[PDB]
Amino acid sequence: PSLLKKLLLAP
Amino acid sequence: ADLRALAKHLYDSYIKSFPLTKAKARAILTGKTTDKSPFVIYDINSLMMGEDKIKFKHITPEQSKEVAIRIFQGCQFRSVEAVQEITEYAKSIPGFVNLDLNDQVTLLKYGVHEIIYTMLASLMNKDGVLISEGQGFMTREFLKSLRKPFGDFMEPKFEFAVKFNALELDDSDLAIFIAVIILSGDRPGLLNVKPIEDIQDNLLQALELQLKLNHPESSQLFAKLLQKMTDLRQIVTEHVQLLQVIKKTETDMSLHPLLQEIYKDLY
Ligand SMILES: CN(CCOc1ccc(C[C@H](Nc2ccccc2C(=O)c2ccccc2)C(=O)O)cc1)c1ccccn1
Ligand SMILES: [Cl-]
Ligand SMILES: [Cl-]
Ligand SMILES: [Cl-]
């Protein structure tokens, strides 16, 4: 799981 | 097309994304504020007294650690938050969220530290750095006194900041400049460079116009600033080499999982 993706897709 | 509107939108986003702006930092550093001054950390004793008031207290549990490790852990706390703020800012750059999600990640992976060091200069004078949103101030001499390689990390950033602060950019200049850094079409492993370059072209035009209007007596301020972008990359390279020394020599010094992801296979 990519944490940068999580930040990027967060609302 | 509307370069003045783009400039304004970026500045509004910057104000929302970054709690301690250059304007506020300079008001603190020159006493022209009605809040009480930062707590000054100049040694281990002032650090122990002040750390309870500083935001990185959130992550401090355990036996007492030596001063160099405490500084390392508190700076890591701040770096993770700075990455999260920059990512929020990046999502406001028009067109950014319409890029391939994997290129968005790559732009952030290679851009955040260049941005961190840029805005770190807004919090520095030649003798120290503001921490914890201006509630603390950590002296350059104290950071230099740390045992190797810890005492080596900050000096190149102070050196950079003294030259960079001499350009006298303000927050409306910086909001566009940092967007230009993020939209760099030459990062390793980008899947589709053309839409990134198209955005940067507009951003570079908006920056050139901003600089001409905000600093009419600095001719070639734009040219000067573009040459700094490249200096930022050398700062990262040297920083990575210092972190590698830590990784090979210190015990129990693993990085936050977000910082590990950025640094993994970086260049
Ligand atoms: C210096 N300062 C302001 C923020 O300065 C930054 C300076 C650098 C960074 C980037 C960040 N750096 C580190 C990441 C993890 C651990 C240590 C560091 C250091 O850089 C470090 C190492 C040894 C000694 C001193 C620092 C990165 O690479 O992700 C982010 C922020 C501090 C210091 C202590 C507590 C809070 N604020
Ligand atoms: Cl300075
Ligand atoms: Cl001017
Ligand atoms: Cl640690």
Write a three-state SS string for chain B: CCHHHHHHHHHHHHHHHCCCCHHHHHHHHCCCCCCCCCEEECCHHHHHHHHHHCHHHHHCCCCCCCHHHHHHHHHHHHHHHHHHHHHHHHCCCCCHHHCCHHHHHHHHHHHHHHHHHHHHHHCEECCEEEEHHHCEEEEHHHHHCCCCCHHHCCHHHHHHHHHHHCCCCCHHHHHHHHHHHHCCCCCCCCCCHHHHHHHHHHHHHHHHHHHHHHCCCCCCHHHHHHHHHHHHHHHHHHHHHHHHHHHHHCCCCCCCHHHHHHHCCCC
Q: Which of B83, B72, B117, B61 is nearest to B259 (CA)?
A: B83
For residue B137, the cross-strand partners are: B40, B130
Query: Which chain B residue's Cα is nearest to A6?
Result: B105
Please say whether the beta carbons of B256 and B76 come within 8 A.
Answer: yes
Quick count: other Cβ atoms within 10 Å of Cβ B264?
9
Q: How far is the CA of B45 from the centre of ligand 3 (A)?
A: 43
Residue length of chain B = 267
Please say whether the beta carbons of B10 and B91 come within 8 A.
Answer: no
| B215 φ, ψ (degrees, to nearest 5) | -130, 70
Order across the sheet with B136-139: list the strands: B39-41, B136-139, B128-131, B124-125
The DSSP element (H or E) to which A2 belongs, if any, is: none
Which residues form ligand 1's pocket by a CB distance below 6 Å?
B 56, 71-72, 74-76, 78-79, 113, 116, 120, 129, 131, 138, 150, 153-154, 239, 255, 259
Cβ separation A8–B91 shorter than 8 A: yes
Cβ separation A2–B262 shorter than 8 A: no
Q: Which of B66, B101, B99, B87 is nearest to B18 (CA)?
A: B87
| Structural domains counted in chain B | 1
Q: Experimental method for this entry?
A: X-ray
Distance between CA atoms of B26 and B198, rounded to whole angstroms?
34
Closest-CA distance of chain B to residue A1, Å:
10
CA atoms within 13 A on the CB side of B259: 20
Collapse the DSSP code of A4 into the 3-class scheme (helix H, G, I; strand E, B; otherwise coil) and give the result. Answer: helix
Please say whether the beta carbons of B162 and B231 come within 8 A.
Answer: no
Query: Which chain B residue's Cα is nearest to A5?
Result: B105
Distance between CA atoms of B198 and B182, rounded to whole angstroms?
13
Q: What is the resolution of this structure in A?
A: 2.0
Q: Which of B113, B119, B157, B158 is nearest to B26 (CA)?
A: B119
For chain A, the straight-line distance linking the first and the last C-alpha, in angstroms and rounded, comes to 18
Q: How far is the CA of B241 from the centre of ligand 1 (A)?
A: 14
- Per DSSP, A5 falls in state H
Q: What is the CATH number of the domain that holds B157?
A: 1.10.565.10
Structural domain boundaries enclosing B251: 1-267
Amino acid letter at B170? Answer: D
Distance between CA atoms of B106 and B189, rounded to whole angstroms?
7
Please say whether the beta carbons of B89 and B13 come within 8 A.
Answer: yes
Check if B68 contacts A (Cβ < 8 Å): no
Q: Which residues of B define the annotated binding site?
A: 76-79, 113, 239, 263
Q: Give the burial class of B183: count Cβ atoms within 10 A of its Cβ; 0-12 exposed, 13-18 middle, 19 or more buried.
A: buried
Distances (CA, A) of B62 to B53, B57, B59, B65: 18, 13, 12, 9
| B137 φ, ψ (degrees, to nearest 5) | -140, 120
Structural Rg of chain B based on CA atoms:
19
Q: Which of B97, B155, B150 is nearest to B127 (CA)?
A: B155
Q: Which residues in chain A are contacts of B101 at CB distance < 8 A?
A: 5, 8-9
Q: Crossing angle for the helix pair B67-90 and B171-182, nearest 10 degrees?
A: 80
Torsion of CA B206, B262, B167, B8, to 10 degrees: 30
Cβ separation B257–A3 shorter than 8 A: yes
The DSSP element (H or E) to which A8 belongs, if any, is: helix A3-9
Distance between CA atoms of B18 and B12, rounded to whole angstroms?
10
Q: Which residues of B define the annotated binding site for rosiglitazone?
A: 76-79, 113, 239, 263
Q: Which residues in chain A are contacts of B187 at CB distance < 8 A?
A: none
Closest-CA distance of chain A to residue B226, Å:
27
Distance between CA atoms of B197 and B190, rounded to whole angstroms?
11
**Mutant choice from B258, B263, B265 vs A, greatest count of A C-beta within 10 A:** B258
Strands B39-41, B124-125: parallel, antiparallel or unpaired by DSSP? unpaired
Q: Which long-range contacts (CB under 8 A, 24 or more apart) does B15-21 make?
A: B15/B171, B16/B92, B17/B85, B17/B86, B17/B88, B17/B89, B17/B92, B18/B85, B18/B89, B18/B119, B19/B85, B19/B133, B20/B122, B20/B123, B20/B130, B20/B133, B20/B134, B21/B122, B21/B171
Q: Which of B236, B178, B192, B194 is nearest to B102 (CA)?
A: B192
